[PDB]
Amino acid sequence: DPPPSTLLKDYQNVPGIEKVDDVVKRLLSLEMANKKEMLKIKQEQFMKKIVANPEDTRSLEARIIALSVKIRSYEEHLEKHRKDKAHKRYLLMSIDQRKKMLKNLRNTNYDVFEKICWGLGIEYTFPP
Amino acid sequence: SNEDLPISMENPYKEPLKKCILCGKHVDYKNVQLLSQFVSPFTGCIYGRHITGLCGKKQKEITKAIKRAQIMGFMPVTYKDPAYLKDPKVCNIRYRE
Amino acid sequence: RQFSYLIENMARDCGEYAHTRYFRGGMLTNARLLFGPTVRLPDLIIFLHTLNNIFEPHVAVRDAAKMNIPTVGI
Amino acid sequence: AKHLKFIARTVMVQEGNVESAYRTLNRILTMDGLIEDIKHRRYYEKPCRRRQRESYERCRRIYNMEMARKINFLMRKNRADPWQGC
Amino acid sequence: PRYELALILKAMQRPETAATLKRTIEALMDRGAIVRDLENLGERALPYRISAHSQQHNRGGYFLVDFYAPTAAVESMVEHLSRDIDVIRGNIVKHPLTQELKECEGIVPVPLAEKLYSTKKR
Amino acid sequence: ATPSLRGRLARFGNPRKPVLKPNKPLILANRVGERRREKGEATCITEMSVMMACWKQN
Amino acid sequence: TKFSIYPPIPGEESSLRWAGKKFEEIPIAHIKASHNNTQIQVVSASNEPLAFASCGTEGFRNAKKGTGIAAQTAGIAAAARAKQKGVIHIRVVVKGLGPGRLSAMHGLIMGGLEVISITDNTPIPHXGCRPRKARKL
Amino acid sequence: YHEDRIRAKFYSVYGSGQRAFDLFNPNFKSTCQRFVEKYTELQKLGETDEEKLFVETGKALLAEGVILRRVG
Amino acid sequence: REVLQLQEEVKNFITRENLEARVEAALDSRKNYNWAITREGLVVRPQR
RNA sequence: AAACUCCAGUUGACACAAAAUAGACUACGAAAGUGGCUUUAACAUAUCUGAACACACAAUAGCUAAGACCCAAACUGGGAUUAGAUACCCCACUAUGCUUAGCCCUAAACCUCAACAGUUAAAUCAACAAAACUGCUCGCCAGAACACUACGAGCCACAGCUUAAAACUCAAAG
């Protein structure tokens, strides 16, 4: 997880925010924010680390990253709420969709596919 | 050709869409005076939208604010506050006739 | 029922016939059984109001079409 | 129980006209729907029956309002026959 | 995020109310909250009788506390308010000003439903 | 104002469940219901009770 | 001025006085019109019982107990006892939609008690206990 | 038509004219129509601003003596 | 612009140094959120 | 009639049950379902289709262990009715409806109307119902009854669930 003092993605590039009061810094940080802001930062870090051209969002390489962040969030939610059948279905479908995207990416590049797999830690397993 | 043929235009005589009395104004659960205007003075029941005259969105906001105010101790439940009985009447309902 | 008097007067002046009252069933498709075996059907029917009093098409136009009587209708 | 007394569903009698006061209170309860609610709460109505009753009442309300609107629309044509004899 | 606390304090004297308000705000600060402002709605009779902490309350003092707190401190503050014996009622809600008001153009008319039944003559 | 009817019944284009399930078609008829007689009840019970009360006392 | 159907709330400084007594000082007449009985009890403003009457106490039994004539007879008896103890004006609180809901008030008026207000206190659960099952009659 | 904008504007501001419409006369000219004609004539002259065009049309009617009673 | 606006509002926040002053100021002052609406759609403030 | 009479009425204190009005709203969810208040987490997929058996769910009812008592209530007992009344009516009280941990995997689970994209053209069109069709794909169906059956097989289910026939009979069934 990113450090709690990390600023939000919306305010990470505004000029003059690097020199403000400590109250302002913690108001605009991840500490006083919901879990969605942390997921957006995690998605941004994965986009910078793994793939090039972060502007593109319809690319098959960015859809996998976005779905992987959602998969991790669902797993964290299910870690506490083990009786949430609806989210359990959402997690399973997200896994199936990610595997489908991996299959297409493997048949399309097999080079950025390896880049995605090692960057996110995902392993492509052939179904029985 | 001829310049007297009708042209393609949007209706210029069209009147602006009607707006509810609460349109554009914030509804707050702490505004007990405003919330009391949409309840029955004798039973405290929330009036329907056909009586209040509000839109769908404002009727929902009024209902949520009333329920929140009643459960948090800002508004009576079984009757309307007597202090607000002299407020302007904005509901289309008549009990005595 | 607003121009029945006017239309009947027009028929009198021009020498032709008019029917501005209730149209009994069989005045055209069964005219021989009512007027007589040797009755002569009209050669032309002019409708000034093709709709009856219930805002529906008159039955005379359908009967005229059945009997092959040309119709001039407003 | 925890609310103030004699503020809810209370109607004052004017000039000893108890009949008018009772009718006014009964009309207030009927308009607010309390009278019908109490009558239906004597026995427990199963949710399937409650949904069917609500659907029937909503359909009846729509038909009655539409019929009433047409009657008010056509009531203008209740005048005497203008073209008598035609 | 930004939360607002609606507090109903017991009808005490000024020094007791000030001490209770100071204790409540300090508890919020100890839970990592930045108290934006403190408001005084005033003292009024409760709409209904409230029995809390073995006390029957008919009049109370309504107060508002606006603050920014992390999502993991609201539950702790609620527990603290419950244990406090000078609080008749206390509720923490998302601040109304956080949610913006979407523009409304007007009450669009609803066209009457048509073609619900076939046009065959019954 | 007449309650809305769009998106209420079950048709071939309605995705949602039918809000209303009418047992008869929602079409205005060419008639109205006949007037209902009033179910009369007892009358002058108060006067009868007063007379019987005085009979008991006398 | 205009007659106020709204009750004279004790917070309000109403000038309406009945025989030198304010609205909050007028004794209350609690009427419980059940589906088979009508119980009437007159109590002072300080919750002190003064009179009590019902169809069973007046002699009506079984189905006869729980009619309009039985309800007004109980009202007359309750009013008579109340007037003996010094009751003139009454605030009527009715609890129930059973028979004799209005006949009980009529009996009180015939007894000699003047009604100044009518209040309905019928218990209406807001989503409460589950009533008994429906009857297959 | 193009003049429908002018008619709608004159029916909103300055309201309906005092003169009652005489639809029997084929050559009837109402106050609103006269305002439209003057607005069209000034448009033919070539004024750019629509607001100034509307004001000038009102000025012309005032000079001609046409009564202009605004609803507001 | 939001950051700049928030910068000024921090100066008015309640800290552990002015907490007593803010409490006393709150106890002296009053706040009213009540206002009624009319059929015309006008806000009627409670002039008291 | 039986029952209560440790009863009944006002007032005060007073839930581990259920959420009047809003609701004349038609929203959310894949479905089952979801309508008292607050907070947190959260509502899959940049073409579509694609599994009764793979996986994850699935009203009510039912089972195994630990808890709660307001009310309702299978079974049971009493009272009444009846030729009989093991029912309909009245009273009382259990399992059960609640919570926690596991199970069973059923419904007239139906809006009996598949998913995706598109149309209003003439023969639109057996009848009724909620008008008639086009392109593509999956599932299913083909006389009644035997039969939500026998056997086999699988299942935490052991009076069960899923799949599911045959012999005999009829000229009907719908």
Ligand SMILES: NC(=O)c1ccc[n+]([C@@H]2O[C@H](COP(=O)([O-])OP(=O)(O)OC[C@H]3O[C@@H](n4cnc5c(N)ncnc54)[C@H](O)[C@@H]3O)[C@@H](O)[C@H]2O)c1
């Ligand atoms: N059963 C397999 O291993 C398998 C392999 C390839 C394709 N399929 C596809 O499965 C469908 C069903 O085939 P069928 O009619 O022979 O089976 P079926 O419906 O008779 O089922 C019998 C067996 O097939 C399995 N099965 C059923 N549907 C399946 C599916 N969609 N995917 C995988 N397994 C399935 C069942 O679990 C069972 O083991 C077809 O569309 C077929 O192309 C199945």
Ligand code: FES
């Ligand atoms: S019309 Fe604007 S909120 Fe109702």
Ligand SMILES: [K+]
């Ligand atoms: K409720």
Ligand SMILES: [K+]
């Ligand atoms: K169905």
Ligand SMILES: [Mg+2]
């Ligand atoms: Mg039917």
Ligand SMILES: [Mg+2]
């Ligand atoms: Mg007995």
Ligand SMILES: [Mg+2]
């Ligand atoms: Mg409701």
Ligand SMILES: [Mg+2]
């Ligand atoms: Mg698929």
Ligand SMILES: [Mg+2]
């Ligand atoms: Mg198959």
Ligand SMILES: [Mg+2]
């Ligand atoms: Mg189940």
Ligand SMILES: [Mg+2]
């Ligand atoms: Mg169970």
Ligand SMILES: [Mg+2]
């Ligand atoms: Mg019980």
Ligand SMILES: [Mg+2]
């Ligand atoms: Mg039990």
Ligand SMILES: [Mg+2]
């Ligand atoms: Mg749980």
Ligand SMILES: [Mg+2]
């Ligand atoms: Mg269902």
Ligand SMILES: [Mg+2]
């Ligand atoms: Mg089916």
